[model samples]
Target: SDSPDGIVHLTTNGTILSVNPSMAGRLGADPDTLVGQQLSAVMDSEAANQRLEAGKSAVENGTATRSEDAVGGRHYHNQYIPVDSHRKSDTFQLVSRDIT
Candidate 1:
């Protein structure tokens, strides 16, 4: 789970559109700092990067993907849901859960 404690929303093409405040915190940055950054830059582990890519795939395919991880005494479960914007292509939604 790439940055599981953080929330991420990506465009259909795998560009990170935004990372919520929680995820930004994990990266030692603010939410705004993550907005335009590629999702890969925020991750240091290969597994995590792969997970993010998978999540992006799910979003592009209109499927919901799930992942989990434990970091710095925190437990997290991440959900990636494909946002369709109902054909608008400009709007989408992403939700995150931190069990820690």
Candidate 2:
């Protein structure tokens, strides 16, 4: 569980769909505990909130967004990709590489 990136899948509303162990470890919590939680619950910061809003906006507009942000003390090169759901739903992927 020594990955350099924290990979997460989220819904359009920023609910946590999934998270890698690397991210779990970084948060000092179990991966399962983070599931079904809002991204804001785990990362509650003005910057994180802004980024989440931006990502959600991109998903709604069927576009992608990327930026560098910090969560806790770790810097991440974050990428947000909106994916079309097979069940006519909306989902997105968030990949944050540990650049620190």
Candidate 3:
């Protein structure tokens, strides 16, 4: 509701920690079900891996990070944001918008 974009929070290892309603709905799943799943649960495994790889590189290089993909006639834009937290390891916040 707050963001027009669907947002998901993940650990460095790709474990999903949270998912917003907008995002879950778009994926045709319940938010609770997605909270503990991996990024690939809602997307193609290879695509998710590739996207995460690019995001990690961008973060390490201290550059703006983002990626776009098209599937099933829908365009999706994903923004990757780094998190500094006591969770002790690198983490990321991925916000996806349906731009189609």
Candidate 4:
């Protein structure tokens, strides 16, 4: 696989609910830490903030949002989909790939 593939289910407030093992490690934290943390904390702030704003817009307007962020000297491409789940509240499903 050429991508950083994982599923991160989150709470409506951007709190991580659960993630696949691989994604959990990428944040340099364990699953316990990841669970209550916001996505912005694990990602590049400036880029991720913009992406989150845009993602909210896309989700509200029935669009699929994409953005790129750099972490640990690597470029990451992301596709964000906002989902409403029963136990999770609101969530942004981030499917990502490494570009550099």
Candidate 5:
């Protein structure tokens, strides 16, 4: 769709709130289906934790945080950005792009 990168919005606790079509398809699911699911539902345990941790740091610092991870033979560059305008605090946007 809009972004070539995969984008997903998540709560500070790791619940997936929204996902773009590109992101959902890459995860092998539909956008609406990813709503209300946990980040771990589409990724491994450690990878899920990594995202949550980055999200926490981003919200806590009131800035964006970043990390890179490899999964399923694909390397991903991830960014956790704090956005309170949408649903209040304690939430952030997780933007991902394949770096492989």
Candidate 6:
């Protein structure tokens, strides 16, 4: 709880599937509260787009990848991973943790 915990689940097209409370807080709310809001709504255009690409590569490559980004002068480590799901296409999880 003391750390900046941010994790977001995304479908192939960058749709937000679910998010944890910590991440929801970083993105602006609790999970249920943010479900209706697009991921882009809670992020800067570049960050949202960056997540898009990260998810894209992870799904396409079926591999987990790491990235580092900054906001509020704080740096975070993001992990994009492909998750097995019942859905036809791939689902991705973007986990972000404050490293600053």
Most lDDT-accurate candidate = 5
Model 6 Cα shift for residue 6 (angstroms) = 1.6
Candidate lDDT values, in order? 0.62, 0.75, 0.74, 0.66, 0.86, 0.78
Cα lDDT tens digits, model 5, 10-98, are: 99888989998878888899977789898998778888888799889888878888999988888889998899844566788889988
What CA root-mean-square deviation does each model show from the true structure? 4.7, 2.5, 2.9, 3.1, 2.5, 2.2
Question: On TM-score, who's better, 1 or 3?
Answer: 3
Q: Which consecutive 10 residues in model 4 have the weakest lDDT in total? A: 83-92
List the lowest-lDDT window of 10 residues for candidate 6.
84-93
State the local distance difference test value for candidate 1: 0.62
> Which is the winner by TM-score between candidate 2 and candidate 6?
6
Candidate 3 lDDT over 1-100, as tens digits, reads 3547988777667788888888787778997888888887677787778667755755565554789987657888888877653343367778888888
TM-score of each: 0.64, 0.80, 0.80, 0.72, 0.90, 0.84
Candidate 2 residue 53 Cα shift, in angstroms, is: 1.7
Better of 1 and 6 by lDDT: 6
Total backbone collisions, model 5: 0
* Greater-lDDT candidate between 1 and 3: 3
Which residue pairs clash in candidate 2? none
**Residue-level error in angstroms, candidate 3, position 100:** 1.2
